[PDB]
Amino acid sequence: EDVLIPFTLGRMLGKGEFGSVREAQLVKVAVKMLSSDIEEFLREAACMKEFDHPHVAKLVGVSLRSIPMVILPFMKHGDLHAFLLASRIPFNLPLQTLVRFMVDIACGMEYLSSRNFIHRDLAARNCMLAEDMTVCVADFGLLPVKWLALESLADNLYTVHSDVWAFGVTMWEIMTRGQTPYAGIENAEIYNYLIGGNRLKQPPECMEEVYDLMYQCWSADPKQRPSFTCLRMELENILGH
């Protein structure tokens, strides 16, 4: 398949548990550094290559070094979490801009779920800012306890409904401008917090109707959480008002 790529590596862009990222010249790109495991990587790489949507990060391709590598378009504006943080610690964005980020993410997630694709790691840090400042869902997954639904934590179940829960957490991050969810509560106590009936609190300035929507995303019953289509409609209406 025209997905595999035989470029040269450049400056280090960042690193983490997932591995490291560096720029490369193919066109400037971002390159993600990571038997059986290397097998399905390639398998799922092929399905991700056919994503084609304005609010989903394109896959340029994949490659092999001697570690699996993911080749991505270089997005200079970086990720949404870093941007929200950079507003706070200082630019100011109207409510309109914050709700528009949510609409953008809801469109890309609507598209992914329409293709039966479960992200599993939706969070502000995994949303990228494009040149025109639109947001694109990224990092599809070729532990993040604070974004995980009850049934993901308890039963390891990942569905569109658990993607929707993490979308709700992402809405909260947007409204708090990049604050760590459940700050001062440890990962090991998150489940206990949640089956308690406790949720992330309404941010001080947050429009009630925006909080009502994100709150819906954290229903204990996965079937009670709105769809991405319903999220996008409600967010677009809010944006129009």
Ligand X SMILES: O=C(c1cc2cc(F)ccc2[nH]1)N1C[C@]2(CCN([C@@H]3CCCNC3)C2)c2ccccc21
- 133 or 239: whose CB is closer to ligand X? 133
Which residue out of 79, 104, 121, 163 is catalytically annotated? 121
Asked whether residue 150 is marked as a ligand-binding residue, the answer is: no
Question: With CB under 6 A as the contact rule, which of the stretches 11-19, 88-96, 174-182, 232-240 interacts with ligand X?
Answer: 11-19
- Considering CB under 6 A, how many residues would be counted as binding ligand X? 19
Q: What is the 3-state secondary structure (H, E, C) of 45-104?
A: HHHHCCCCCCCECCCCEEEECCCEEEEEECCCCCEHHHHHHHHHCCCCCCHHHHHHHHHH
Contact with ligand X (CB under 6 A): which of 138, 160, 200, 210? 138
Binding of residue 222 to ligand X (CB under 6 A)? no
- 6 or 16: whose CB is closer to ligand X? 16
Asked whether residue 141 is marked as a ligand-binding residue, the answer is: no
The C-alpha atoms of residue 30 and residue 12 are separated, in whole angstroms, by 10
Binding of residue 21 to ligand X (CB under 6 A)? yes
Asked whether residue 117 is marked as a ligand-binding residue, the answer is: no
- 22 or 199: whose CB is closer to ligand X? 22
Binding of residue 30 to ligand X (CB under 6 A)? yes
The C-alpha atoms of residue 211 and residue 82 are separated, in whole angstroms, by 22
φ, ψ of residue 31 in degrees (nearest 5): -125, 115
Q: How many CA atoms lie within 13 A of 165 on its CB side?
A: 29
Give residues 101-130 in contact with ligand X (rule: CB under 6 A). Answer: 125-126, 128
Asked whether residue 28 is marked as a ligand-binding residue, the answer is: no
Indicate if 163 belongs to the active site. no
Q: Which residues contact 4 (CB under 8 A, 6 or more apart)?
A: 42, 61, 62, 63, 64
The C-alpha atoms of residue 63 and residue 134 are separated, in whole angstroms, by 28
- 24 or 206: whose CB is closer to ligand X? 24
Contact with ligand X (CB under 6 A): which of 22, 34, 44, 73? 73
Angle at 140 between CA 134 and CA 143, to 5 degrees: 115
The C-alpha atoms of residue 166 and residue 149 are separated, in whole angstroms, by 7
The C-alpha atoms of residue 89 and residue 43 are separated, in whole angstroms, by 41
**Which residues are known binding-site members for ATP?**
13-21, 32
Active site residues: 121
Which residues lie near ligand X (CB under 6 A)?
13-14, 16, 21, 30, 32, 57, 72-76, 78-79, 125-126, 128, 138-139
